[PDB]
Amino acid sequence: ASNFTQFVLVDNGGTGDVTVAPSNFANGVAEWISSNSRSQAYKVTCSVRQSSAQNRKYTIKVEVPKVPVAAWRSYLNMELTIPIFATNSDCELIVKAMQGLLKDGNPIPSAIAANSGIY
Amino acid sequence: ASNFTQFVLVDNGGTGDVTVAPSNFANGVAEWISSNSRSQAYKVTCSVRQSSAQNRKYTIKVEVPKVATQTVGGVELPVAAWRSYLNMELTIPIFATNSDCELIVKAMQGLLKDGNPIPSAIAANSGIY
Amino acid sequence: ASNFTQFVLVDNGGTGDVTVAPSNFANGVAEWISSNSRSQAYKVTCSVRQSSAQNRKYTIKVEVPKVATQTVGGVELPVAAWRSYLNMELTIPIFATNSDCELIVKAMQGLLKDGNPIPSAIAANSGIY
Amino acid sequence: ASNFTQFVLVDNGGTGDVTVAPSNFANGVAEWISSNSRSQAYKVTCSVRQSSAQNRKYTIKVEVPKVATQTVGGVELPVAAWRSYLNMELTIPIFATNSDCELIVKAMQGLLKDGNPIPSAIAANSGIY
Amino acid sequence: ASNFTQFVLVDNGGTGDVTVAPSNFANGVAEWISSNSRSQAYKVTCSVRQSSAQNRKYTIKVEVPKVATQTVGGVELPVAAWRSYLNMELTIPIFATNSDCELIVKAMQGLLKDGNPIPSAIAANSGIY
Amino acid sequence: ASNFTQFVLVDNGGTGDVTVAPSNFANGVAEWISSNSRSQAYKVTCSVRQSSAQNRKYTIKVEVPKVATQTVGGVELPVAAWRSYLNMELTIPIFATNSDCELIVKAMQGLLKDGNPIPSAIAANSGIY
Amino acid sequence: ASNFTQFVLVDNGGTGDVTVAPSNFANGVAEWISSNSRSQAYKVTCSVRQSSAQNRKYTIKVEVPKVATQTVGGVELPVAAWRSYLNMELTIPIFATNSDCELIVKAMQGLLKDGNPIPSAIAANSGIY
Amino acid sequence: ASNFTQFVLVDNGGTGDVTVAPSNFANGVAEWISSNSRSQAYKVTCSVRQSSAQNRKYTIKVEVPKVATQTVGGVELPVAAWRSYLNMELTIPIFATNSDCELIVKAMQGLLKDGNPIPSAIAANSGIY
Amino acid sequence: MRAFSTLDRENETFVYRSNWTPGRFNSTGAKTKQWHYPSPYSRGALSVTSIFSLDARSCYSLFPVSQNLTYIEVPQNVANRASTEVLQKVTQGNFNLGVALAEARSTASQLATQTIALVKAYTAARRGNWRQALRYLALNEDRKFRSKHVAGRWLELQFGWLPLMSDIQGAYEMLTKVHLQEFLPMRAVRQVGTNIKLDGQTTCNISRRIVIWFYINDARLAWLSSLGILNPLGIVWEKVPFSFVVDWLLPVGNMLEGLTAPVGCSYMSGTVTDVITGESIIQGTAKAQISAMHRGVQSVWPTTGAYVKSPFSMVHTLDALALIRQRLSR
RNA sequence: GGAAUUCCAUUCCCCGUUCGCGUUUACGCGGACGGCGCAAACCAUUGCGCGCGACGUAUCGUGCACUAGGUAUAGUGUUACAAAGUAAUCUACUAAUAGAAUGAGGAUUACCCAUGAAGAAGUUCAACUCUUGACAAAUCCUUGUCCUGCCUGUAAGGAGUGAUCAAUCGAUCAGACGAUAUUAUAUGUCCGGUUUUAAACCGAUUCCCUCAGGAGUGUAACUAGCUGCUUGGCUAGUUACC
C-alpha cells in the first residue's frame, strides 16, 4: 500500500493521455517524470515540511513544456498551509476547495484557458 | 591465442550490429573501438590492477555517442551531439575460486536480462517505484 | 583609330566568354572592367612611363576574382570570395625598333601558349620538375 | 610527368623559329636559355614559392635581346641597352581548384593575343590612346 | 630530360671502371659520389654562379681517395688513407659564343692528353724543367 | 728529362691547331704561349710547391680568348670581356707514388672526356639541371 | 743552355742509380727531388747570394732518407725511417778567377775521393783515428 | 728550345772578342757574365714583368768595367777602376703583335748602327750639335 | 653496415682472391603520382683477409648465405620479434609523420588553441567572473561595463570575440576542405638483431630493419569532411539568445572527438632489409668475412587491419576536450 | 626864619868677474862676489605782707576690745462700554481624538525575512577518508585807452721512681694485523773501560585494616623533389627566432 505510484496527469480523452511515473524521492522530496525524453517531460514534485509548531506546509510544483528540446516551459508553484488541528473531515474539505476552484466553468480556470485576466 | 579480440557490442538482430575492434594496449589499459563507418566511434576499455594486498579490481568503460545532422542552407551541419557513459569497478578478493568467478559474471548477466526491473527502468526513462 | 577598345579576356569558345570593356583613363592608368558589378568584375590596367633616361617601363595588372554571394546582416550581397593577381613589368629600351618590339610580344605569347611547360605547371598545380 | 623540358618560345611559322632549352636549377629557380651566348640569348626563369599560408606566388622573368644591327657573337656595350626585360608575378590563392587555375591561364592568354590592345600597343612603341 | 646523370670517372678499359653516381643537390651545388660508403668514396661537385655582371664562374671539385685496408682486432674495414683534391674554377664572360665555349673545353682536354708536359710531370712526381 | 717543350693545346684534327710554345721561366713558373699578341694568345702556366708538411699543390692556369668576331692584332677593350680564365689547384699528398699520380690524371681526363655531364654543360652554357 | 737539369746523384752501378730531377726554383733555391714518393725522395738544394762586400756564398743541402714502411692502425704507408743531412756552405771571394774556382772544386773532389781518410770514416761510422 | 744561351757582346773582328756566358737565373732575373773574375767581368741582365694591367716592361742592365790591378796593403788584387752602366727600360703593351715587336727591335738596332748621330756622339764624348 | 670493397684484389703468399663481389643487382620501382614504390636491391662482399690457399668466392658455405649473396636465412626468433615490435608501434602511436600530417596537426592545433580561448571566456560569462573573461579575449581588465544583464555585457565585447569566431573557421575550414581530403602518410621503424655461432668457428650478426609506410584510410574522416559550420559574420547576434555559443560549437565538438578517436589505416608498402656481418676461423689459420645486404618488398601487415592511436591526439586537443566535456556538457 | 648874647661874633634851632835659464840667442831674465593789717612822711599820700540566674564553706555573678600668763609683762582682729468717541487624501476612535530575481524561508495572507565534480584512488560499500597826440564815453573844460647522724633508681648516681710496650739494662707517660704490496723494500693503522756478550753502556595488579575501607605501581623562411641512384628506400631535411 503506497501512493508513490503512477497517475494520469492530463485527462486528454482516452488516447492522448499523458501518464506520469515516479522517478525520485531524494531528501523527502517526491518527483514524477513522464516517460519520454527528459527535456520533453512533465515534472511533478511534492514535499511536506513542519514549518512551525502549529503548521504543516505543502509544496506542489508542475512544469509543462511545449512539444528534441522544449521551446518554452510553464511553472506551477502552489503551497498549502494546514494547521495540526484540522481533522480528516476538515482536510477533505480543503481538497474540495481546490477541486471546486479549478473545475471547468469556474472563472479562474476559464481565465487561464483563454490568456485572460479577471474581467 | 589471445583474448584481446573482436566481438559484437550491440546485437541489432544481424542487420546493423556494431562489432568492436582492438586498437590499442598502451599503459596497461586495453582499448577497443567500433568498426569503420560514417559515425562517431565507440570505446570499450578494460584495465586490471592489484589495489590492496587482498583485492583485485576490474575497470570497464563504455561510451555511446549520437550525432544528428540537418541540411540547412546546402550543408550538413551537426545539430545535436551527446554521449552516455558506463563506468563499473569490480573488487574481487584473492580468495575467490574460478567457479566463484563464474558466479560473479552470472550475477551481472542476470541483472541486465530483458524483463528484469533494472533494464526495465533504463529503457523507459523511469525509476524503481 | 584608337587602341583603347574592347577585347575578350577569357575565350571559352564563343559561349560564356568574359569580354572586357574600357571604363577609365584617369592618372595615366588605363583600366578595363567586364560587364559585372565593381566587386565581381575582372580588372585590367596599363601604364607607360619613362623610368630611366634609356628605358621605357610598362606595368600591366590583371585581377581575376571568384564570384560568390555573401550574407551580411541577413542580406545577400554579391562579392568575390578571393581574387588572383597578375603583375608584370615590361622594360623595353628606347633604342628598340618596331620589329624588335614585336619579338618581345611574340615572346610573351609563346610563353603562355597551351602545351608549354610554364602554363601546364600552373593549371596542374605542379612545380617545374 | 616532368615539365622541365624544351619548348619553342618565339614562333615564326615553321622556319625561323627560336627553340629555348633548359639549363640550370640554382636556388629554386628553373632557367631556360636558347642557343646563343649568355648575353644575346632568350632566357626564361620560372620559380614557384609559397608566400604565406594562403597564397602561392609564381615569379616569371623573360629576357629578349634587341635584334636590329646585332653583331652575331660580338661584344656589345652597354649591356642594358641591347636587351629587353619582362617581369611577371602571379598570385593564386590556395582555395582555387584545378578548374580555377585553368581560367587563370586563359586569363593571361587572352590579354596577350595578337589583335588585343595590350600586345598591339607594345608592338608599336605606343601607349593606350 | 636531365644532364645530372651517371658517368664514368676513371676509364680502365672496360674492366674495373670507376663509375660515379648522382646523390645530392643541396644549395644549387650538384654532387656526384661513387658507391654509397661516403668515406672511401670518389666525389665530384659542380656549381654555377653569376659572379660579376658580365662573368660566370664555374666551380668543379674532384676528390680522389686512395683506398686501403685497415685492420683493428682482426676485423677488416676498408678506409681511405689520404685524399687528393682537384679544385678548378673557370671564369667565362657572358659575351662568349657557344662555339667559343667549345674552344674552352678543347683547351682543357688537350692540356691533359697523355704526352703533353703537364700530365707528364704529374705522373712522374716532378715539375716542369 | 726535359718536359718544358712545345705541344698542341687545342686539337682541331690536323688543320687549325693552335700549337702553344714555351716563352718564360721566371721565378719557377713554366709559361707556354702561342704565336700571337699577349692580349689574344693562349697562355698556360704550371708551378710546383709544397703547401704544408703533408701536401703538394700544382697550380695550372689557362687563358682562352673569345674568337667570335675577333679583330686579329687590333686593340680590344675591355680586357676582361674578351678572355676566359682557368684555375686549377691539385693538392696531392706526399705519400702518393707514381702509380697513384697516374690515377689522379686519369680522373682529370675522365672528368673532361666528351659526353660527360660536366664538360657538356660548359660547351652548352648550362649548369646541372 | 741551362744547368738546372736532370743529373745522377748516386752512381750505383748502372741499375740502382737514383737520378734526381728539378722541382722548384722559388726564392732563388734550385731544388732537385727524385722521382718516387715525396716522403721517400732525395733532395739537393743550391743558392748563391752576395753575402758581403767582397764575398759570394753558396749553400748546398742534401737529404738522404732510409726507405721503410709505416704501419699504424693496419694501414701501411711509404715513409722514411730517418734521414741524413749534409749541409755545406762555401765562401768564394769576388777576386777569384775561373782558374781559381777550378782549384776550389778540385779541393772538394779530392776531399771525398775513396781512399782518403775522411770518406773512409763516414763509410765505417768512424772518426779520425 | 731555349734562348738563355751564350753570345758575343763586343765584336773585335774575331780576335779580341768578349763572349758572355749565362750564370744565374734566380729571382726571375737572367744574368750573363764574361769569362773573368767576378770583379773584372762584364755583366748583362734581363727581366720581364707585367707592370700595369695593360703593359709589359723590360729591364736590361749592362756593365762595362775598366780593368786594373790595385795594391791593397801590399797585395795585388784584380779590380775594376771604373764601370759604365747601361740601363734601359722598354714598355710594350699587351696589344702588340709579334710583327709589331719586330718593328721595335729594328728601331733599337737602327738607333745604334754605325754612322748614326747618337752612336757618333757617345764615341766622341760630344753632344748633339 | 660496415665498410666493404668491391674491387676484386688477388694476393699471393709463399710457403686465391682476397675479396669477391657479385654483380650490382639493380632493380627499379614503380612510380605513381602520389607515392613512389620501392624496389629490391642486394650487395655484399665475401672477403678473405689472412692465411694452402683458399678461394674468397667459395666462402659462402661457411656463412648462412646463398651464392648470389641475396638470400639470407634470418632466425625465426629475429623475424617474429621484428614483426610484432613494428606492428605494436603502429597501434600504440609511436611513429613518424609525413609533411601532410605535420601541417594537418598544426592546423588542428589552432582549433584547440582557440576553442580553449572561447570556452574559458564563455564559461567566465555564465559564472559572472568578468575579470577572467577579459584576459582570454586579450582585452584590458580596466573596462567597466554599461549594461547590467549578463547577455547585454556579452554583446558589448563583440569586437573582442568575433576575431576568435572567424579564426576558428580559419582552422575549421582548412581541415574539412583541404587537409582531411589529402593523402596522409606515416612511417614506423624497428630493428631486431642477434648473434649466431656455427661450427664449420664462425660468428655472424644477422639483423633485420623493417620500415612500413601506411596512410590514413578511415570512413569517419570522410564524414567530418562532409560537415559544415555556421558563419559568425552572417548571424545577427542581437536577436539570438546567449546560449547560442554552445549551439555554435557543436560541429567543433564532433571534430575534437572525431579526430582524437583511434583511426583506421591502410598501408602503401614497405621495405625489409637484412644485414649479416660476420667472421670465420679455419696450424692452418684463415679469416673470411661478409657484410651483405638485401632489401625486400614483402608486406608485414595483418588483414584484420590496425586502428592507430591518432596523431591528432595532442596536448592541446586533449585540453579542448577537457573543457567541452566538463563545462559545456559534463 | 628864630634864641641868647661878652651884639660887626658866635652858640643853639851703472861697471866688472862669474855659474845656471830660454831659440825675441853679437838678444832676454835671474843668483853670488867686487867695486586788709602794719611803717614814713613833705600829710585825704605813698612803700610793706530590691529581684535575677549558679554553685554549697550562709558562697559567688550580673542588672577699743580677745585669747594665754603673774613682780601690773606679753600677744592679736470688530467685540465693550460711560456712546457719533475713545478702548480695542486614507485610518482608528465617533459631536472628538491620533496617526500614513530567488528561498521545500514566515506569516494575523495583497504582509514581513534572507541573499543579489572528477581519479585504471581505498575501504569498515547508499557511508566516509585521500588526491586534483589821434581814439571812444556822459552827467560834459573829464576821465579812459595807444669526710657527713647527707638522699636515692643501691656493686651505680647525684648533693653539700713509678706503668704500660719492647727485648740489646731498650724506647713511652705522667712489537702487533686472517694489513698491501711491484717483496730482505717502501709501506697502512696502533782510544780505553765493564757487563747482559757479535750486542750496549760508561769517558588493572600487589599491601594493609577497625573491613563494602585506605596505601602503591609554436613562428616565418631556406634548401631540394626529374624512373633515377641505392654500403640499411626515397614520400622530405636542417637552421634561425618565441
C6 close to C20: Cβ distance less than 8 angstroms: yes
Does residue B89 approach strand J to less than 7 Å at its CB? yes
Best residue of A3, A23, A40 to probe chain B, by most B CBs closer than 10 Å: A23
Q: List the single residue in A4, A22, A36 with the smallest CB-CB distance to B125.
A: A36
β-bridge mates for residue A10, sequence order? A18
Report the distance from CA of residue G72 to the C1' of nucleotide J180 in Å, as an integer. 40
* Full DSSP string of F13-73: SSSS-EEEEEEE-GGG-EEEE-SS-TTTS-EEEEEEEE-SSSEEEEEEEEE-B--TT--TT
Sign of CA dihedral E121, E125, E127, F3: negative
Q: Which of C18, C10, C25, C16 has its CA nearest to residue C40?
A: C18
d(CA E85, CA F89): 8
- Is the Cβ pair D1, I178 closer than 8 Å? no
Q: Supply φ then ψ for residue I115, to 5 degrees.
A: -80, -10
Helices of type H across H2-126: 98-110, 117-122
**C1'-nearest nucleotide to the CA of B85:** J118
- The number of beta carbons lying within 10 Å of the beta carbon of residue I62 is 22
D76 within 8 A of D68, measured Cβ to Cβ = no
Containing H/E element for I202?
A: strand I202-216
Q: B29-65: string of b/e by CB count within 10 Å (b at 16+)?
A: ebbbbbbbeebbbbbbeeeeeeeeeeeeeeeeebbbb
- Inter-chain contact I3–E16, Cβ cutoff 8 Å? no
What is the rounded CA–CA span in Å between residue G42 and residue G87? 14
Buried b (16+ CB within 10 A) or exposed e, E6-22: ebebbeeeeeeebebeb
- In the DSSP assignment, the letter for residue H108 is H
Radius of gyration (Cα) for chain C, nearest Å? 18
The DSSP call for residue E74 is T
- Check: CB of residue A69 under 8 Å from CB of residue A39: yes
What is the C-alpha to C-alpha distance for residues H107 and I303, in angstroms, rounded to an integer?
100
Give the residue from I83, D38, G95, D21 showing the smallest Cα distance to E93.
D38
| Pairing of β D7-10 and β D30-34 | unpaired
- Residue I198 host element (H or E): strand I185-198
- Statement: the CB of D77 is under 7 Å from strand J: no
Going by DSSP bridges, is the β-strand pair C91-93/C55-72 parallel, antiparallel, or unpaired? antiparallel
User: Using CB atoms within 10 A of its CB, is residue B68 exposed (0-12), middle (13-18) or buried (19+)?
Assistant: exposed
Burial (Cβ within 10 Å: 0-12, 13-18, ≥19) of residue G104: exposed
Apex CA E60: angle with CA F46 and CA F101, to 5°? 50
Task: Tell if I47 CB is < 7 Å from nucleic strand J.
Answer: no
Instruction: Test F85 with E97 for CB contact under 8 angstroms.
Output: no
| I246: region left, alpha or beta (phi > 0 left; psi from -120 to 50 alpha) | alpha
Domain boundaries, chain I: 1-98+183-217+263-309, 99-182+218-262+310-330
* Alpha-carbon gap, residue C109 to C114, rounded angstroms: 10
- Across the interface, whether the CB atoms of B24 and I329 are under 8 A apart is answered no
CA distance E119 to chain D (A): 31
3-state secondary structure string, chain B?
CCCCCCEEEECCCCCCCEEEEEEECHHHCEEEEECCCCCCCCEEEEEEECCCCCEEEEEEEEEEEEEEEEECCCCEEEEEEEEEEEEEEEEEECCCCHHHHHHHHHHHHCCCCECEHHHHHHCCCCCCC
Nearby residues of H32 by Cβ (< 8 Å), 6 or more positions away: H7, H20, H21, H22, H23, H42, H43, H44, H45
- For I173-195, the DSSP string reads HHHHHTGGGS--EEEEEEEEEEE
CA neighbours closer than 13 Å in the CB half-sphere of residue B107: 7
Q: Which has the closest alpha carbon to F22: F11, F33, F9, F14?
A: F33
CA distance A116 to A89: 35
Binary contact (I236, C70; C-beta < 8 A): no
Q: How far apart are CA F85 and CA F76, in angstroms?
A: 17
Cα separation, C92 vs C101, whole angstroms: 8
CATH superfamily membership of A1-119: MS2 Viral Coat Protein (3.30.380.10)
Report the alpha-carbon distance of residue D98 to residue C124 in Å, rounded. 6
Residue C122: closest CA among D19, D3, D51: D3
Using DSSP's 3-state secondary structure scheme, residue C46 falls into strand
Residue I135 burial (CB count, 10 A): 14
Judge: F126–D33 Cβ closer than 8 Å, yes or no.
yes
Partners of E43 in beta bridges: E33, E63
Contact I194, I206 (CB under 8 A): yes
List the alpha helices (DSSP H) in A14-106: 88-101
Q: What angle do CA F54, F58, F59 make, to 5 degrees?
A: 135
Nearest nt to the CA of B46 via C1' is J120
Query: C52 is written with which cell numbers?
Result: 630611366
Contact (CB<8Å) C71/I236: no
CA distance H102 to F79: 24
The whole-angstrom separation of Cα F15 and Cα G14 is 44
How far is I309 from B33, CA to CA, in rounded Å?
11
User: Domain limits of chain C?
Assistant: 1-129
Grid cell of G56 as nine digits: 759570394
Q: Within 7 Å: CB of D7 and strand J?
A: no
Which residues of chain C make contact with D36, given a CB cutoff of 8 A? none
> What DSSP letter does each residue of F59-96 carry, written as one string?
EEEEE-B--TT--TTS--S-STTTB-B--EEEEEETT-
Measured between alpha carbons, how far is B102 from G9 in angstroms, rounded to an integer? 106
d(CA C46, CA I234): 37
* Burial of H46 per CB tally in 10 Å (0-12, 13-18, 19+): middle
Evaluate whether H43 touches H57 at the Cβ level (below 8 Å): no
Which residue from I314, I253, I320 is spatially nearest to I93, judged by alpha carbons? I314
At residue C107, φ and ψ (nearest 5 deg) are -75, -30
Distance, in angstroms, between F97 CA and closest chain E CA? Answer: 8
Any idea how long chain H is?
129
**Amino acid code (one letter) for H56:** R
Q: Which residues of chain A are within 8 Å of residue B124 when distances are taken between CB atoms?
A: 21, 35
User: C-alpha cell of B57?
Assistant: 579490481
H or E element in which residue D77 lies:
none
Whole-Å CA distances, C93 to C51, D34, D44:
10, 21, 19
Are A4 and B127 in contact (CB < 8 Å)? Answer: no
Q: Strand J within 7 Å of which CB atoms in I 105-124? A: 106, 109-110
Closest C-alpha to G65, from G46, G37, G88: G37
Rounded alpha-carbon distances, angstroms, from residue C102 to D36, D41, D66, D106? 20, 16, 10, 21
Class of domain B1-129: alpha beta
C73 touches chain I (CB under 8 A): yes
Contact H94 F39 (CB under 8 A): yes
Q: Is D53 exposed, middle or buried (0-12, 13-18, 19+ CB in 10 A)?
A: exposed
Q: What is the largest CA-CA distance in chain C?
A: 60
Strand J contacts (CB < 7 A) among D residues 37-66? Answer: 49-53
- H116 Cβ contact list (under 8 Å, min separation 6): H110
How distant is the Cα of C1 from the closest Cα of chain D, in angstroms? Answer: 9
Helices (H), chain A: 88-101, 107-112
Q: Which chains touch I (3 or more CB pairs under 8 A)?
A: B, C, D, E
Examine residue C65 and say whether the peptide bond preceding it is cis (omega within 30 degrees of 0).
Answer: no
Elucidated via: cryo-EM
Q: CA G112: distance to chain centroid?
A: 13
Interface of G with F (CB under 8 A): 5-6, 21, 23-26, 35-39, 77-79
Residue with cell 749565362: H22
Q: Which amino acid is at E37?
A: S
Interchain contact I318–B (C-beta under 8 A): no
Binary contact (E98, F122; C-beta < 8 A): no
Q: Which of I7, I22, I6 is nearest to I68 (CA)?
A: I22
F44: chain E residues, CB-CB within 8 Å: 111, 118
Provide the 3-class DSSP secondary structure of residue H110: helix
Q: All 3 cell numbers of residue I232? A: 559568425
- In whole angstroms, J183 C1' to E73 CA is 37
- Give which of I91, I311, I260, I314 is closest to B26, Cα–Cα: I91
Beta carbons of A57 and A51 less than 8 angstroms apart: yes
Residues 36-55 of E with CB under 7 A from strand J: 36-38, 40
Q: Among D4, D23, D72, select the one facing F126 at the smallest CB separation.
A: D23
- Residues 157-216, chain I: which have Cβ under 7 A from strand J? 185, 187, 191, 193, 207-209, 211, 213
Residues in chain C closer than 8 A to D126 (CB atoms):
3
Could you tell me if D59 and D44 are in contact, meaning their C-beta atoms sit under 8 angstroms apart?
no
Comparing alpha-carbon positions, the chain H residue that sits nearest to F73 is H97
CA–CA separation, G112 and G107 (whole Å): 9
Q: I233 near I223, Cβ under 8 Å?
A: no
Residue H60 three-state SS: strand
**Helix, strand or coil, per DSSP, at residue H23:** strand
Measured in whole angstroms, the distance separating CA G5 from the mean position of its chain's CA atoms is 15
DSSP string, G39-58: GG--EEEEEEEEEETTEEEE
Question: Grid coordinates in use for I59?
Answer: 666462402
Q: Closest by alpha carbon to G54, among G98, G103, G95, G89?
A: G95
Q: How far apart are CA G128 and CA G123, in angstroms?
A: 12
Q: Which of E61, E71, E69, E59 is nearest to E33 (CA)?
A: E61
Q: Return d(Cα D126, Cα C92) in angstroms, integer.
A: 12
The label of the residue with cell 726535359 reads: F2
Question: Rounded CA gap, A78 and A67, in Å?
Answer: 24
Q: Would you list the DSSP string of chain G?
A: --S-S-EEEE--TTTS-EEEEEEE-GGG--EEEESS-GGG--EEEEEEEEEETTEEEEEEEEEEEEEEEEEETTEEEEEEEEEEEEEEEEEEETT--HHHHHHHHHHHHHHSSBTBTTHHHHTTT----
Residues 219-238 of I with CB under 7 A from strand J: none
> Omega of the bond prior to D78 within 30 degrees of 0, cis?
yes
Chains touching C, CB cut-off 8 Å, 3+ pairs: D, I
Between the CA of I37 and the C1' of J234, what is the distance in angstroms? 9
Q: Are strands E55-72 and E43-49 parallel, antiparallel or unpaired?
A: antiparallel
- Give CA–CA dist G99/G105, Å, rounded: 10
Beta strands in H30-127 (DSSP E): 30-34, 43-49, 55-72, 75-93
Which residues pair with residue G77 across a beta bridge?
A: G70
Give the E-state strand segments of E7-74 in sequence order: 7-10, 18-24, 30-33, 43-49, 55-72
Q: What is the DSSP letter of H73?
A: T
- Give the distance, in angstroms, between residue G74 CA and nucleotide J15 C1': 133
Query: How many CB atoms neighbour CB F95 within 10 A?
Result: 19
Describe the crossing of helices I111-126 and I250-260 by its angle, rounded to 10 degrees: 130
CA neighbor of D125 nearest in space, from H16, C56, I178, C42 = C56
Phi-psi region of I271 (alpha: psi -120 to 50; beta: other; left: phi over 0): beta
Chains within contact range of chain A (3+ C-beta pairs < 8 Å): B
Q: Edge-to-edge strand order for the sheet containing B30-34?
A: B7-10, B18-24, B30-34, B43-49, B55-71, B76-93
Tell me the chain I residues in contact with residue D56 when contact means C-beta distances shorter than 8 Å: none
| Residue E101 CA distance to nucleotide J34 C1' (Å) | 139
Give the distance from CA F11 to its chain's centroid.
13
Resolution in A: 3.6
Can you tell me whether residue A21 is helix, strand or coil?
Answer: strand
Long-range (24+ apart) CB contacts under 8 A made by I278-281 are: I278/I63, I278/I202, I278/I203, I278/I204, I278/I205, I279/E74, I279/E75, I279/I202, I279/I203, I279/I204, I280/I59, I280/I62, I280/I63, I280/I200, I280/I201, I280/I202, I280/I203, I281/I201, I281/I202
Bridge partners (DSSP) of residue H101 are none
**I residues 284-313 near E, CB within 8 Å?**
287, 289
Chains I and H touch (3+ CB pairs under 8 A): no
In angstroms, what CA-CA distances link H114 with H13, H16, H118?
A: 15, 20, 9
Ramachandran region, residue G46 (left: φ > 0; alpha: ψ -120 to 50; beta: rest): beta
